[PDB]
Amino acid sequence: MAARTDNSIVVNAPFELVWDVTNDIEAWPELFSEYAEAEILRQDGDGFDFRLKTRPDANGRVWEWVSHAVPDKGSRTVRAHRVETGPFAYMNLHWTYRAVAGGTEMRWVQEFDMKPGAPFDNAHMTAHLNTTTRANMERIKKIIEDRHREGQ
Fold this sequence. Notes:
Layout: E1 3-11, H1 15-22, H2 28-31, E2 35-43, E3 48-54, E4 64-72, E5 77-82, E6 88-100, E7 103-114, H3 122-151
Antiparallel strand pairs: 1-7, 2-3, 3-4, 4-5, 5-6, 6-7
């Protein structure tokens, strides 16, 4: 009854680099094709809230919202969720990093449910997010590997 996406990818680089690149919020406009702006608004000890503003989407519509994140480097995981849910009833995010042979495996999990009346229903939104997440994970993969190559 609730929607969810679960995607993984291996980046041939150490944990430290993979972690610092992906958690660098102010760089998301460069890492993610959908974001035009991204800024940390404030810090609340363990965690912080940030604002995201998209580039025109497939229909030319620009979206903006505030989220709250709680990264935990010690446990190689990061949790986040929308504060201003937009068309979502709720939107949760869970990322994990695991050391594997050759690099680091990133696993991104999204848990959400559409508000009755939203332009998208669960099934269609799930497919959409799977598509966009896969493209972003592959993109970020190349970027991190370039940096790594440059550091060696």
